[PDB]
Amino acid sequence: NSSTQSYKDAMGPLVRECMGSVSATEDDFKTVLNRNPLESRTAQCLLACALDKVGLISPEGAIYTGDDLMPVMNRLYGFNDFKTVMKAKAVNDCANQVNGAYPDRCDLIKNFTDCVRNS
Numbered sequence: 001n002s003s004t005q006s007y008k009d010a011m012g013p014l015v016r017e018c019m020g021s022v023s024a025t026e027d028d029f030k031t032v033l034n035r036n037p038l039e040s041r042t043a044q045c046l047l048a049c050a051l052d053k054v055g056l057i058s059p060e061g062a063i064y065t066g067d068d069l070m071p072v073m074n075r076l077y078g079f080n081d082f083k084t085v086m087k088a089k090a091v092n093d094c095a096n097q098v099n100g101a102y103p104d105r106c107d108l109i110k111n112f113t114d115c116v117r118n119s
Contacts, residue, residue, distance in 0.1 A: 003077050003084065008033050010076045011050055018049035037117070038110055048109035061105055063095035063112055090119035 015032050018024070022045040031043045038044040051057055056064055056072045064072065069092055077084045094115035102108035 002081060003087075004035075006077050007035065010054065014050040014053040015046060017053060018046055021049055022046050038113055041106060044106040044110045047113070048105040051109060052105065057105060061103065061108070062099040063091075063108065065092050065095045065099075069095070087116075090116050094119060 012033055015024075015029055019029060022028075022042055024042055024046045028040070028043050028046050031038065031040075032047045032050065036043075038047055048057075051063075051072075054072055054075060056069070058064055058068070069088065073079070073084065073088050073091070077087070079085065094112055097115055098108060098111045102111055
């Protein structure tokens with residue numbers, strides 16, 4: 001499956017770059033790479049670091065929306081599949097839902113990813 005693979009292709013190196021900063025283990029890498037629920041702070045912080053690296057997080061620590069989300073979606077998935085259209089909408093709506101509520105980017109990413117999973 002294409003979206004699972006492309007996500008891993010783009011994020012894997014970024015997650016690896018981020019591991020030391022949050023004292024992540026290999027299992028934490030795998031949690032993030034597999035898009036599993038982020039039920040430890042370390043996993044939450046590792047993904048947040050990697051999403052900052054991929055360009056999803058603004059200077060004021062918010063999740064990008066609208067046009068600013070597009071380069072990230074093109075990097076992670078591209079738009080060969082219609083489900084990515086729906087994912088883009090979900091990511092945009094979820095970003096609007098959680099922005100403002102979580103100064104800490106790990107908490108932001110926890111609540112963001114919960115939203116997108118349940119969307």
